[model samples]
Target chain A: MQTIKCVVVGDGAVGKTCLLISYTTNKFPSEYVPTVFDNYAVTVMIGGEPYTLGLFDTAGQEDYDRLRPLSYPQTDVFLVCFSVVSPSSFENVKEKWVPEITHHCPKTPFLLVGTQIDLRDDPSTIEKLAKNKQKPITPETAEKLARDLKAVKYVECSALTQKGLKNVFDEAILAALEPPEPKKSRRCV
Target chain B: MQTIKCVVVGDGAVGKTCLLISYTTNKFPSEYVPTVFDNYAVTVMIGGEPYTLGLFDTAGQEDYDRLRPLSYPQTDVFLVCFSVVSPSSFENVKEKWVPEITHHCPKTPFLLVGTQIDLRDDPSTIEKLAKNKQKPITPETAEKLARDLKAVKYVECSALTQKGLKNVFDEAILAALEPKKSRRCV
Candidate 1:
């Protein structure tokens, strides 16, 4: 059995915990809950080898900004999650999340995960955004940002609907197995 | 006549020049040509009052980064343009354009304009982006970014097809006629 530690980071209420819980329990959380620090473990068989896939969730609030990086060490991979319906969270992918992760674990591979994609086309969500003169994050924009941030890949999921949930972990497993070359040398000899 | 100075900014080759040319001349250029501070003026009637609508175009290349703001000072409004077919250019709208304009004319109101909308659904354009594992920026995403950036409005246009081109200017006029309160006091 192999162990793969995958940490998730993004803006608050972007559904980081829901992503993990939905993957583990197969139930959508009905209410919004802020996460301080919580994690889950699952045994996934990838290519006939069991992987102790650990999913760690972190707080995205500025108060935790100093303590969040403490979980970066020994992270086999990361799922940088943001809501497809949240333009601010997506902005933070470039403005905050990517920079924070790269600063802490420059060599660790991560996947850009867009959560709440189900809301992308929900009428109420669309109307709410329109009221504020906004719209949901499109997949193309997220994928482009993922590439620009140099993530291993970009994936999106709807925890409420459980769509793309399995693939999220699947990609996480693969990323851990074959991480891309670090953009810069992190060697400290 | 009141003169509404609208300055356009975005990444190079995102069709800033083409947008102005198409809007002003009603003809799209067949080839890409870098612009160097060229401007166009038109008299548009808003509520039966004629106003000088000055469309100022700026170069988006790094070389013009310093010179671009020379045209920013008196800008009553801005058309922060980006290509729907070019995500990097869209990214620069937030990463570069908005910050640049706000820094120069802190009280100016701007609209987030997505250009090259004609290519948004073109199969060849879609295939090209698909080759790179990318796709065109959707109107929803652009609008969301516009709202987040505090843009007065989000508009899209196609220079080649002239689709939504007139609306771009109309909205610009409306935005200029009654600019929103500055997001911050300067």
Candidate 2:
């Protein structure tokens, strides 16, 4: 039916490119070519209705910030990804991703994903390794963080394994479809 | 003996910050934040000799090209991370990461990591699903890429479980300690 314009914005390698490739081509490039600003369209049959998904995979390198302003007008849904293994990336999500979206596309629906879940291969080793190092953040801590985002939805996906990727899109699509939220009072646009 | 100045460059959330946090602070934040430039330092003992490591985590979404000239000067190591799960991020390493490093610091030892290996949890689904969608690449195909890149070594790590992380720093130290491989003349 309607073409839903969405953008998957995250730091490079958080699976942003792979997630889109998986969705559109189901392909995984072993290494990423630094992406510049560009828009891609894919179609998926949802409820027997053909929907066009227009996606923008934005560059995450520091030099790419200049292109961000240009990205605002085209974004409808914002997909933010971070690695489950890295807390700082998650922290950046709160400090940077949210504010940028608010400033640029305040009305856009957002989805958060903790990517690279497959890294937690040996749960037992996590505890042991941490003990050896003297610091440990349990799996429980990650789940709690997901609850905190309180976005329309949260998913922990592994782009390498392609786990929870479809769900990442599904949630974003569902969020995009919901009635647009009433705008919050702010300085006149 | 010598300080191995290493920089971690990637798109903001590609896990540079968290990987640094885990290596430096031993924790990952529960939320996402845009990382423009966050710098830290750590040291490792290799062969009983102390090596100083200065780590720089930059914003993937900010302006890096301008800093390209300044970023690589005096740096001895470059650690580039991309999500193993995100092929696009991986592409950045091929197209963006190495060349940028060469442009800035032509002689630095490079270490490449595919962060977030936890995504490999569903291998069958990955193969089947990817085939169904007709994705052009797979893990097997990626190996050829590794050889072409001339990587000292490649590892798939998950900061969550800390897999392959030890190798990250370990390689840094080894790359620093081992004598450089001189390019063969044509």
Candidate 3:
């Protein structure tokens, strides 16, 4: 069977570990342990063919910035994650993660992932953000960012809720199988 | 008027900036802009008198780990924030931020702040955690950590909803005014 290498990156605590653990083990981790560099592999069937889907988790902390790119070589796909509720994480996708990934593997396609969609509409969450005059990143906005950044697609999931969880991996497989054309980068909104 | 200097420290995007912005501006910032070092000052009335409530925001990135302590001198109070939805951020509260602050300002008091409470019970948030066999950090757990860490208090709030927002600062003022006994370093 062939293998597809999918790497995940984003700011620390944006749920990259949960995203991988939930997908690979069908189990969510109860603790919030920061990742140094962890990877998981699963046998995923694509179009009636079994392929080893290697999922890689990278630390997003600046402390690990120099060490993280070591996992990027020969990457088949990348999931750039950000919490929908965390505006800074979303911004880093453009400012940090994308540039890092592109610098190493410019041809390897990646997806713009929004994690913790469950909090997107929580009244308290909305109320908290409203006080700051901020709102959760809508799917439309995420999609726009993905397009501008040249990601294969934009997908979101709740590693906690499991909402849109499966689709995230499914899209990763598709992107790895068929890379998307590069698009022009746009200014920060 | 006297000034109560309150500094916020936490992991990046753990809502430290948003919490400070929301509290000071009374409005949420639509965009997420990471802070290097930002300060906000507001006139807060405490005990029938006015005081300058100076809120300082610090970046939690390791790149700034050395530079962050530059803002620690003469700090009256500290707000160590962690997102309730982010277990890693919460973990760092004990493993990283607490030790860093305590190392820099051994006598200065600090509060353990649980941010993003609005999502604590959100069904999707809960479901996601359930899959991982994880759950949101409860107030009891946070309080326990605060006690263990010798923080002045443990408070939770939603910067977006302004839930418990005012009390966070009110307690900061009180903690600063009545400085707790400097506990023996563990």
Candidate 4:
């Protein structure tokens, strides 16, 4: 009966849409649509009672940066996503995302989501990054940034294979409902 | 990381679509599209581990009866839904929906769902049913039929208000993962 509002923010094309959709994909002429995706909800049982997990996906394009904050209000938790295969997307997590969300929701908690891990091992993907003197973000690197930015924690997942996908949302729920005590008295309203 | 397949089936316009959409509503040029709904998945925690609930919605028109079961294979559970405001839809729960699902998923479990409870109290809806000397389907009637047809249980909800939406899926997960064994063994 209670809805936990979780908004996902990040740099565009960092696989934010894929992160959301692959976690909750469906039929009806199914193919990735580049436009805005519809809002989604899921039921999670905590202590034998059901909680509605309301998920909002924001367009990370700078074109919508001025308007993206509309989805930031009252956010119980946020997933600051970037592709493990895209170094700039990872940099923007600290440079762009953390600042934007903290400015709007100073008390809200977020997890640094390293998305597209499936591509992390791809030869072409690796080669593409290598040419630019970049490479897939290692978990250690991402985690350190998460610590520096005061993220609740860093989580990585490949939406395509669904590896670690469930856990990303799982951690999101835990962060929302039960932020570690002796810290901010966080609650997913 | 395990997937539990659940399919929802009921008569056309029984608010079957609304049951699914309202349980998992979203915004994107927001309004009902009514063509065919995309598949939906929700992460549910069972014993501290997350389970992916893969929900498939099927069109209930007679034209699709032959095609609906395409979504039925390997289904862990089913929500056989009917609108509380429609007596015929309720009848079809036994006459059509049950037989169809049982025929395909002989061993799979299902819940008898009474959808659209918000309309059950609306004056217009009540008056509409009154014209036919009928009223909203009561829980007693639904429970009796659930027993008669051997459904997992009878549950009802108003997708519009989401009064019992969460519990419906909660019970669904329990039924799928933990069906009572003593009686069935007996």
Q: What's the ranking of the predictions by TM-score, best on top?
A: 4, 1, 3, 2
RMSD of each: 20.4, 25.2, 24.3, 16.1
What DockQ does each prediction reach against the true complex?
0.01, 0.01, 0.01, 0.02
The 10 consecutive residues of candidate 3 chain A with the worst lDDT sum are A180-189
Q: Model 2 reproduces what portion of true contacts?
A: 0.00
Which prediction has the highest TM-score against the true structure?
Answer: 4
| Number of clashes recorded per candidate | 0, 51, 23, 1
lDDT-wise, the better of 1 and 4 is 1
> In candidate 4 chain B, where is summed lDDT lowest over 10 consecutive residues?
B177-186
State the weakest 10-residue window (summed lDDT) of model 4 chain A: A25-34
After TM-score superposition, the amount by which residue A40's alpha carbon in candidate 1 deviates from its true location, in angstroms, is 0.7
Q: Mark the regions of model 1 whose C-alpha exceeds 4 Å error after superposition.
A: A31-36, A178-189, B1-186
TM-score against truth, every candidate: 0.47, 0.43, 0.47, 0.49
The i-RMS of every model, in angstroms, reads 27.3, 24.4, 28.1, 8.6
Q: Judged by TM-score relative to the true structure, which candidate is superior, 3 or 4?
A: 4
Off by over 4 Å in 2: A31-37, A122-143, A146-149, A178-189, B1-186
In terms of docking quality, how is candidate 4 classified?
incorrect
TM-score of candidate 1 against the unseen true structure: 0.47
Candidate 3 is graded, for docking, as incorrect
Which number leads on DockQ? 4
Backbone-clash count (model 4): 1
